[PDB]
Structure formats: structure tokens, C-alpha cells
Design a protein around this motif. Structure first.
Motif, PDB file in Angstrom:
ATOM      1  N   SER A  10    -124.651 -83.286 -23.453  1.00  0.00           N
ATOM      2  CA  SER A  10    -125.986 -83.827 -23.669  1.00  0.00           C
ATOM      3  C   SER A  10    -126.012 -85.349 -23.696  1.00  0.00           C
ATOM      4  O   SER A  10    -127.071 -85.938 -23.451  1.00  0.00           O
ATOM      5  CB  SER A  10    -126.581 -83.273 -24.968  1.00  0.00           C
ATOM      6  OG  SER A  10    -125.789 -83.617 -26.091  1.00  0.00           O
ATOM      7  N   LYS A  15    -128.941 -83.448 -19.022  1.00  0.00           N
ATOM      8  CA  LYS A  15    -128.779 -81.998 -18.989  1.00  0.00           C
ATOM      9  C   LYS A  15    -129.888 -81.287 -18.226  1.00  0.00           C
ATOM     10  O   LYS A  15    -129.714 -80.120 -17.859  1.00  0.00           O
ATOM     11  CB  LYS A  15    -128.699 -81.450 -20.413  1.00  0.00           C
ATOM     12  CG  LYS A  15    -127.280 -81.228 -20.904  1.00  0.00           C
ATOM     13  CD  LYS A  15    -127.270 -80.772 -22.350  1.00  0.00           C
ATOM     14  CE  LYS A  15    -126.918 -79.305 -22.463  1.00  0.00           C
ATOM     15  NZ  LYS A  15    -126.402 -78.978 -23.819  1.00  0.00           N
ATOM     16  N   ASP A 171    -126.495 -85.369 -28.346  1.00  0.00           N
ATOM     17  CA  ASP A 171    -127.699 -86.189 -28.316  1.00  0.00           C
ATOM     18  C   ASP A 171    -128.610 -85.953 -29.517  1.00  0.00           C
ATOM     19  O   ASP A 171    -129.804 -86.264 -29.446  1.00  0.00           O
ATOM     20  CB  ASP A 171    -128.469 -85.948 -27.014  1.00  0.00           C
ATOM     21  CG  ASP A 171    -129.119 -84.575 -26.958  1.00  0.00           C
ATOM     22  OD1 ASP A 171    -128.634 -83.651 -27.645  1.00  0.00           O
ATOM     23  OD2 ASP A 171    -130.114 -84.420 -26.217  1.00  0.00           O
ATOM     24  N   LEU A 175    -127.180 -80.941 -36.699  1.00  0.00           N
ATOM     25  CA  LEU A 175    -127.873 -79.662 -36.699  1.00  0.00           C
ATOM     26  C   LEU A 175    -129.139 -79.779 -37.537  1.00  0.00           C
ATOM     27  O   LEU A 175    -129.119 -80.349 -38.633  1.00  0.00           O
ATOM     28  CB  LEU A 175    -126.971 -78.557 -37.246  1.00  0.00           C
ATOM     29  CG  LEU A 175    -127.667 -77.231 -37.566  1.00  0.00           C
ATOM     30  CD1 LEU A 175    -128.149 -76.546 -36.293  1.00  0.00           C
ATOM     31  CD2 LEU A 175    -126.756 -76.310 -38.361  1.00  0.00           C
ATOM     32  N   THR A 177    -132.887 -77.745 -39.004  1.00  0.00           N
ATOM     33  CA  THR A 177    -133.458 -76.441 -39.323  1.00  0.00           C
ATOM     34  C   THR A 177    -134.071 -75.796 -38.089  1.00  0.00           C
ATOM     35  O   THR A 177    -134.116 -74.564 -37.985  1.00  0.00           O
ATOM     36  CB  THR A 177    -134.509 -76.580 -40.424  1.00  0.00           C
ATOM     37  OG1 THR A 177    -135.497 -77.540 -40.026  1.00  0.00           O
ATOM     38  CG2 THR A 177    -133.859 -77.031 -41.723  1.00  0.00           C
ATOM     39  N   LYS A 214    -121.493 -74.401 -30.983  1.00  0.00           N
ATOM     40  CA  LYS A 214    -120.767 -75.570 -31.470  1.00  0.00           C
ATOM     41  C   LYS A 214    -120.644 -75.552 -32.987  1.00  0.00           C
ATOM     42  O   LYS A 214    -119.633 -76.007 -33.536  1.00  0.00           O
ATOM     43  CB  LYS A 214    -121.460 -76.851 -31.003  1.00  0.00           C
ATOM     44  CG  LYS A 214    -120.917 -78.124 -31.634  1.00  0.00           C
ATOM     45  CD  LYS A 214    -121.973 -79.212 -31.649  1.00  0.00           C
ATOM     46  CE  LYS A 214    -122.389 -79.577 -30.236  1.00  0.00           C
ATOM     47  NZ  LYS A 214    -123.830 -79.928 -30.149  1.00  0.00           N
TER      48      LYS A 214
END
Ligand code: ADP
Ligand code: ADP
Ligand code: 0XI
Ligand code: 0XI
Lengths: 253, 256
Positions: A10, A15, A171, A175, A177, A214
Motif C-alpha cells: 500500500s 494499489k 498506508d 489497525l 475499528t 497482517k
């Protein structure tokens, strides 16, 4: 080696656009890696140099028809060409490195990468010629071929070299929600299994699982004395500050 | 001991795919024509290629073939390996454009060297790529060495390894000369083409890292057994490689 880094698709590619490299970003990230002075081992993703074609031909689902063989060869050349551009920026920033394509070196079986011979990678690392792995089509002992992710390449290197730190570069600040397409997005501080099982969706060409996959790799790679981070590579100097140990907005497992 | 292959092993020499004079210069016209000649022949092939001009220049300047002796060689080796991997991608692209699926297999990334021999401890990935129809394309490279830190394997040695592994029916070296001559045909106007090379004639002939024509002829003579013939052909002669792949008689040096 001490700090194991993945340059995600990314940040190093656009992408949403096939075969579109982000050269300025990779150049800066390589400069931040050198400036940090840390001992580093770098993996990178395929981004739009692999996922667009692989998704169109369902390469990760295995060898089903013969139209996939030319597409897999094309996608393999595309991603090896992306790796050359990554390695070019590394060499220019004073980081000797060489691409190590898993599809030319190893095989797969039931979604696992089989690394029978570790000697070339270990010898390259000892010499100081950093072996740079990346996502690739790989021969499969059951489905003819499969796709290994750079995420799993990170896992192989983690159990091979036991890094003190594991850094994923993408990018996103971390992480959330939910994907920053909904404005209720909330940055997640520390990843636990339950805090993700969180809305994770995929809106670009993907074949290997996105942020959720990931996250699992990050959670799997944590240990008694090893933290796993996800940092926004589009934020200037944030990767540099992380390798230096400074406080940065990010997610940790 | 039987043979289970129709494959023709081909080396596109660095003298043909690049300009040995200049540096980092890819001969797109020539490689494209040779890829077309390979495609038109309709044969099953496996292509090796050389490392080209810029790789040979850096390797000689830093004495890469003599092993790892100081740290200045480390960035030079990495730079040379990136150049030859870029060259391989350009060779592979010409094969893909003809409808021949292929992928680069860099020896320095997959194998090791010891006592001047390329060591392939794990043959499974290479064989599986070939069984899938994705042609594995090897080339001369800097390779980790078990005694000298690193060394250099040539495309010629890569041919001997693949010859032992896949047992081809025919071996073809593609270079910038009609064949082995009595002397260097570029500097001896009286040089005569040796149409058939033997140990005697090679020794009595008058013959850059990894050696030149002599090393090539030696690998050629070693690979001629069990009814396999080995050829050196001028890749700069249009249609000559194609006619050789079709089984026609052409100007060349053959070892029988
Ligand atoms: N819950 C979430 N938190 C953060 N990002 C998300 C989430 N769900 C989806 N995404 C999207 O996933 C993208 C990154 O996915 P990933 O494949 O891990 O990146 P890379 O290409 O670096 O591997 C981000 O651009 C983001 O838009
Ligand atoms: N006796 C000889 N016969 C033929 N060529 C020779 C001889 N001696 C020297 N040469 C030179 O060797 C060159 C071939 O170099 P080589 O390393 O085999 O090229 P490549 O391996 O890149 O195809 C020829 O261009 C020729 O000028
Ligand atoms: C999509 C991919 C690899 C995924 O790896 P990634 O998840 O690290 O991006 C690929 C497909 C065809 C050829 C080469 C690579
Ligand atoms: C000279 C060489 C390979 C020889 O192979 P060749 O004899 O087939 O041309 C090389 C040098 C530096 C980096 C990579 C390769």
C-alpha cells in the motif's frame, strides 16, 4: 536482521493502479532506514504488481486451467521487476541488498511456505548483502502453484533470525475499528485477538487477506521479548522515529 | 540409462544480449529476434543467458571472482547482482512476449558455490517450475561461496548443471562468433572456423571473467555423451539459431 521490516504494497505501490510504483515513498523509507542506524532485514509486498493479475486469474486458488500459466509468469516478472525497483532505492541509500524470489527458491504445501534450504539466505545476510524477500507465486505440492504473502515471508524470517522487533509499514496509522472509509473509524492502540474479531474489509485488488491477515501474522510473531508494530509509511520520518525508539502514533501487538 | 526429455538447452551469451563495449546496454533488437527464432522453431527449450557487459566490468574491478577479501566488495557485488537481475527480467520479457512463459531463477539467490562448482542442494523448486510450464531461466551471477565468501558462477556452468538435471537432447551456445576458430577471428584475418571441436583441436587452437571460448568449448565437450550433441552458433546471424533448432545444417562448431 535485528529489526525485521515489511514495506507493504500500500505504500510502495498505488494499489488501485496496476504496475504503478511509489518511488518517492520507497526512497524516503530507505533513507529513514539508513538514518536510524539499525540492523534491518527488509521484506516487501507485491501491491498492484501482483494482486491485480493474481485476482483476475485466481492464482491463489491453485492451478485449475492452463490460461493461468502465462498470467502467473507475467505476474512473477512484474513483481520481480517491482523488487528490483525496491532494491535500487535501497542500494542508492547505502543499504546493500538483493532480491530473493520465493517462487524460484521454495515450494508451498497447504498454505505454508516450505524452506528446506536456508543456507543461501543465511549466507547472504552474513555477507551483508541483505536478502530481500517478497510475495510471489510459488510451486505447490498439491495445487500446482500457490501464492505466498510477504506477511508469511516475515514469519519465516522471524523464526529464522529471531528479531528483536517486527515492523509492518502500510498506508494506515494502524489497525482501526473499521476501515477509514467510515468516519467512525477509531485507531486501535494494542492489538489483541478479540479486539479484531473490528470491521476489516477489502476495497482494492487483494489475494492474501488484507489488514486482518497482517494482524494475525503480527499476533503470531509476538514473543516474550519481541513487539510487532504497524506504522504509517506515508507519514514522513515516522518509520525513522520508530526504529530509533521514539514515540510514534502506531499500533502494536 | 534412458532419456525422458525433448528439451533443447540454449545459452544466450552476454556478447549477444548486451554490448560488451558499452556498459549496462541491452540489445533489445537482437534478443527480440532470438526470442522470435526460438518461438518459431516450435521446440521445447530452456534458456540460460550471460551476465552482460556491466556485470563483468564491476566484477573484474572488484575481483569478485577471487572471493570476499574486504568490505568494499559488498556494495559492488549487490550493485552487480541487481544489474544482472534487471538484465534477466529484460530477457524474460522477450520470452513472455512470444508466448513462452518463463521466470528468472537467480543462482546467487537460490544456490551456493564450493570449489568452483555450483551446488544445487534442493532441486524441487526448479523442477516444479519446469513441470508447470514456467521455464526457469538461470544466468551468471554472484553466488555465496562456502570457502571464499562469494564467487561467480557463469551461465556456462549453469548450462552444465541444467544439463545434468534435465538431460537435454541438444545443447546450443549462442555467441557473437560463427564458432571456434583457429584464433580470435576479430584479430586474426587468417583465422579459420573449426567446424568440429575435439580435445586435440581445442588444445591446439589459439583462444571478462569466468573464461571465454575455451571454457565454453570445455563445457561443450563435457556435455556430449549419451547421444547429445552440443553446438556453438552465431546469434548475430539472422535465422541461424532458428534453423539449428529446426534440425537444419548451419554454420557452427559442433562437438560430437
Ligand atoms: N479496520 C481497518 N483498519 C485499518 N485499515 C483497514 C481496515 N479495514 C480495511 N483497511 C484497509 O486496508 C488497507 C491496507 O491493507 P493491507 O493489505 O494490510 O496493506 P498492504 O498493502 O500494506 O499489505 C488500508 O489502506 C485500509 O484502507
Ligand atoms: N579461437 C577462438 N575462436 C573463436 N573465438 C575466439 C577465439 N579466441 C578468442 N575468441 C573471442 O572470444 C569471444 C567469445 O567470448 P565469450 O566469452 O565466449 O562470449 P559469450 O560467452 O558472452 O558468448 C569471441 O567474440 C572472440 O572474439
Ligand atoms: C499477489 C502476490 C503476492 C502477494 O504477496 P503480498 O501479500 O506480500 O503482497 C503475487 C502474485 C503473483 C506474482 C507475484 C506476487
Ligand atoms: C561475470 C558475471 C557472471 C558470469 O556469467 P557469464 O559468463 O555467463 O556472463 C557476474 C558478475 C557480477 C554479477 C553477476 C554476474
Amino acid at each position: 536482521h535485528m529489526i525485521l521490516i515489511k514495506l507493504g504494497g500500500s505504500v510502495i505501490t498505488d494499489k488501485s493502479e496496476y504496475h504503478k510504483f511509489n518511488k518517492e515513498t520507497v526512497s524516503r523509507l530507505a533513507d529513514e532506514i539508513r538514518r536510524s542506524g539499525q540492523d534491518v532485514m527488509v521484506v516487501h509486498g507485491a501491491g498492484s504488481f501482483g494482486h491485480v493479475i493474481a485476482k483476475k486469474y485466481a492464482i491463489q486458488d491453485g492451478h485449475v486451467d492452463d490460461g493461468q500459466i502465462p498470467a502467473a509468469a507475467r505476474a512473477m516478472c512484474d513483481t520481480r521487476e517491482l523488487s528490483s525497483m525496491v532494491v535500487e532505492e535501497l542500494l542508492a541509500q547505502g543499504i546493500p541488498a538483493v532480491s530473493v524470489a520465493p517462487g524460484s527458491c521454495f515450494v508451498m504445501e497447504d498454505g505454508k511456505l516450505i524452506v528446506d534450504n536456508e543456507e543461501p539466505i543465511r549466507r547472504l545476510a552474513d555477507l551483508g548483502i541483505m536478502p530481500v524477500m517478497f510475495g510471489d507465486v510459488v510451486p505447490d505440492r498439491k495445487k500446482g502453484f500457490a501464492i505466498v504473502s510477504g506477511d508469511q515471508c516475515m514469519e519465516v524470517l522471524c523464526r529464522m533470525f529471531d528479531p528483536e522487533k517486527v515492523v509492518f509499514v502500510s498506508d494506515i496509522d494502524g489497525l482501526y475499528t473499521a476501515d477509514p472509509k467510515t468516519d467512525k473509524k477509531a485507531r486501535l492502540i494494542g492489538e489483541v485477538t478479540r479486539k479484531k474479531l473490528a470491521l476489516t474489509d477489502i476495497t482494492v485488488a487483494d489475494v492474501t487477506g488484507g489488514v486482518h491477515s497482517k494482524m494475525e501474522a503480527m499476533l503470531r510473531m509476538t514473543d516474550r521479548n519481541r513487539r510487532c508494530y504497524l506504522v504509517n509509511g506515508n507519514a514522513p520520518n515516522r518509520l525513522y522515529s520508530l526504529l530509533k525508539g521514539e514515540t510514534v502514533t502506531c499500533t502494536v501487538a
